Amino acid sequence: PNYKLTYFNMRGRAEIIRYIFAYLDIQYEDHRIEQADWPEIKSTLPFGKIPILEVDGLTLHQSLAIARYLTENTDLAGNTEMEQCHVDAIVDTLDDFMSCFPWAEKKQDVKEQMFNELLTYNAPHLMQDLDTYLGGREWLIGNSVTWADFYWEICSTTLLVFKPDLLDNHPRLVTLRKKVQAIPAVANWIKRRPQTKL
């Protein structure tokens, strides 16, 4: 099975897919494009959005649909049917927040204002909600790591770029981040991946 992942040269929405490839030890082409190459790719796509993942000549889309597909019937999926639901819910909650950010906003002052508002007013409540949900458990869902723990680490890493103090009052969330970063395949990918701001 031949894999080609296309995205911008950044972690962004594609990183969850990259973590999953790493963990499952699957080789793939990590295709990263410039903004100036985007329009000619975009015009050929069914839905005009990245990331996309090509598998044996079939173009998949939607970052989380792809991540869910790649983890189905692996240990990164929930351990029960209910656990898979919890995984999906946490992932969407995180995605809902990250999606609020005006990432492609060209007017810098308007962009700054919004980032500031979401990070100062909204991000702290999500952290609180996540902290209580985790409680004293080892992973977000069940007794072993799921791709929701992956997604938490990935989202939180980007949020900490803009707001370094985000988890000062949430040591158990920091512990979860660190636990994720300690998984051998993930540590390895973290070590060797392209370093970009986002």
Ligand X SMILES: N[C@@H](CCC(=O)N[C@@H](CS)C(=O)NCC(=O)O)C(=O)O
Active-site residue, 69 included: no
Q: Which residues are annotated as a binding site?
A: 7, 13, 38, 48-50, 62-63
Element (H, E) at 69: helix 63-71
Tokens 């929930």 locate to 78
Asked if 113 contacts 101 with a C-beta cutoff of 8 angstroms, the reply is: no
Find the shortest distance in angstroms from Cβ 112 to Mg ion. 25
Taking the complex as a whole, the smallest distance from the CB of residue 89 to ligand X amounts, in Å, to: 8
In sequence order, the 6+-apart residues with CB closer than 8 A to the CB of 53 are 3, 4, 5, 6, 17, 59, 60, 61, 66
- Closest listed residue to residue 16, CA positions, set 42, 49, 54, 53: 53
- Which bin fits 86, alpha (ψ -120 to 50), beta or left (φ > 0)? alpha
Q: Is 62 in the site for ligand X (CB under 6 A)?
A: yes
Interacting residue ranges for a copy of itself, rule: CB under 8 A: 46-49, 55, 58, 60-62, 64-66, 68-69, 72-73, 81-82, 84-86, 88-89, 91-93, 96, 99, 129, 132-133
Contact 53, 17 (CB under 8 A): yes
**Amino acid at residue number 87:** V
One residue of 6, 12, 23, 170 binding ligand M1W per CB under 6 A: 12
Q: How far is the CB of 103 from ligand M1W (least distance, A)?
A: 4
Please identify, among the stretches 57-65, 68-76, 115-123, 131-139, the one whose residues bind ligand X according to the rule CB under 6 A.
57-65
Q: Provide the annotated active-site residues.
A: 7, 13, 103
Q: Interface residues with ligand M1W (CB under 6 A)?
A: 8, 12-13, 95, 98-99, 103-104, 154-155, 158, 198
